[PDB]
């Protein structure tokens, strides 16, 4: 594990086919991983065949930069979020025709429920909304002004069984819509994430015990990092957001929180994602600056476990 | 194999593409002055214009487009850091089978 997840080897580069300046901002694998899905700075979404490298479809989703993509487990649905243009988030269908199903006009981030995906959780500033996928109707809003932490990058989220919600550093019980606990605030930005094991809560550098609210680990190398887990919850990838984007990503052992490797890519990292096989890692990689009137941003594909 | 719907980007008309470009540049500017320093906007606009319009001789449409992509990236960077600062939809699918 420390051997495999410390070795990465670039095998291809994807660029926007018709552009003079590539403008990718976001990536995700499709449900069956035949395609890489790439959002762009202008609000389009491009699908590239991983095997052949060909672009196969382009869609027009938003009017500003794509910030988040999440295909549903079955591949019939897709969530998107953008940057400044309303609607900021939306729900698309991916069957015979690409179509828009629902708008979440003011939600800057959006996520499927984790057990059965019949619900969407949305985030508007410090407020969480839960929606029903069929109707689009808002089922409940979670908010408490006396308990808020006002994290700058707040992103509400379900726990693996869908019985709990984390929002702005507050544990909510969904069934009763009552606040259960409020986690101590030690940073200004990162609001936190559930471990796939269902036992721990990870908030910036602090790992808390979900049952007893004990402080279990302090992991300094996670500070201000955007966190992603692999499919089995054994490995964490992180990329630092202080352009404030770091040029490295770090791998961690997800069971004991021990560091594995730091991989310098010599490009600013905008985003990254993993398949379900631990075969490939995809990274959005930027070079240049506003001063040079050049912000070429490309996607590099890596083999995991080979050097 | 996995299948995906055909793209709809090509289903936008020429006329509506030009209007999209004109309308969006104006809107991004009005939005960006509430997040980014005003003189940064002015500076990127004027430099983009000197380079692609005056120096390289590209159309005003191409020039506006290179400029928009740069501002969209600036806005992306601003919002990812976290922000506490004080209209026709998508084109139709192509007809199935064609």
């Amino acid at each position: 594990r420390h051997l495999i997840f410390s070795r990465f080897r670039p095998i291809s580069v994807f660029r926007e086919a018709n552009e003079d300046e590539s403008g990718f901002t976001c990536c995700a694998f499709s449900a069956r991983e035949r395609f890489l899905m790439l959002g762009t700075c202008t609000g389009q979404l491009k699908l590239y065949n991983v095997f052949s490298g060909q672009e196969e479809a382009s869609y027009n989703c938003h009017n500003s930069a794509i910030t988040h993509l999440e295909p549903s487990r079955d591949g019939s649905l897709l969530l998107t979020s953008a940057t400044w243009s309303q609607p900021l988030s939306a729900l698309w269908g991916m069957k015979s025709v690409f179509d828009m199903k629902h708008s979440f006009t003011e939600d800057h981030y959006v996520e499927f429920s984790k057990h059965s995906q019949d619900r969407v959780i949305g985030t508007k500033g410090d407020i969480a909304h839960i929606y029903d996928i069929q109707t689009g109707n808002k089922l409940l809003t979670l908010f408490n002004p006396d308990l808020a932490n006002n994290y700058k990058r707040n992103c509400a989220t379900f726990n693996p069984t869908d019985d709990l919600v984390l929002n702005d550093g507050v544990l909510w019980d969904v069934r009763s819509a009552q606040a259960i606990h409020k986690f101590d605030k030690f940073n200004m930005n990162i609001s936190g994430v559930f471990h796939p094991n269902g036992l721990e809560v990870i908030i910036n550098t602090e790992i808390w015990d979900l049952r007893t609210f004990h402080l279990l680990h302090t992991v300094p190398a996670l500070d201000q990092c955007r966190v992603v887990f692999n499919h089995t919850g054994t490995v964490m990838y992180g990329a630092m957001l202080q352009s404030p984007f770091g040029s490295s990503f770090r791998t961690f052992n997800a069971t004991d929180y021990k560091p594995i490797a730091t991989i310098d890519v010599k490009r600013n990292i905008f985003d990254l994602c993993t398949d379900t096989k631990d075969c490939y890692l995809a990274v959005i990689e930027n070079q240049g600056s506003m001063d040079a009137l050049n912000m070429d941003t490309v996607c590099r594909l890596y083999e995991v476990g080979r050097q | 194999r996995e299948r995906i719907p055909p793209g709809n980007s090509g289903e936008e008309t020429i006329g509506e593409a030009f209007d999209w470009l004109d309308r969006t540049v104006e809107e991004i500017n009005r939005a960006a002055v509430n997040h980014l320093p005003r003189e940064l906007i002015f500076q990127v606009w004027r430099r983009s214009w000197e380079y692609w319009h005056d120096e390289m001789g590209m159309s005003v449409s191409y020039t506006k487009y290179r400029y928009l992509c740069l501002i969209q990236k600036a806005m992306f960077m601003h919002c990812k850091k976290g922000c506490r600062c004080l209209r026709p939809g998508p084109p139709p699918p192509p007809p199935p089978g064609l």
């Binding site: - | 090509g10 020429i14 593409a17 590209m58 449409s61 191409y62 487009y65």
Partner: peptide, 19 residues
């Protein structure tokens, strides 16, 4: 102009580049 981009074999960028 009601010509589709696909009818013209153009992307947005190419359309703006030509004029």
């Amino acid at each position: 102009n009601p010509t589709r981009l696909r009818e013209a074999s153009k992307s947005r960028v190419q359309l703006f580049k030509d004029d």
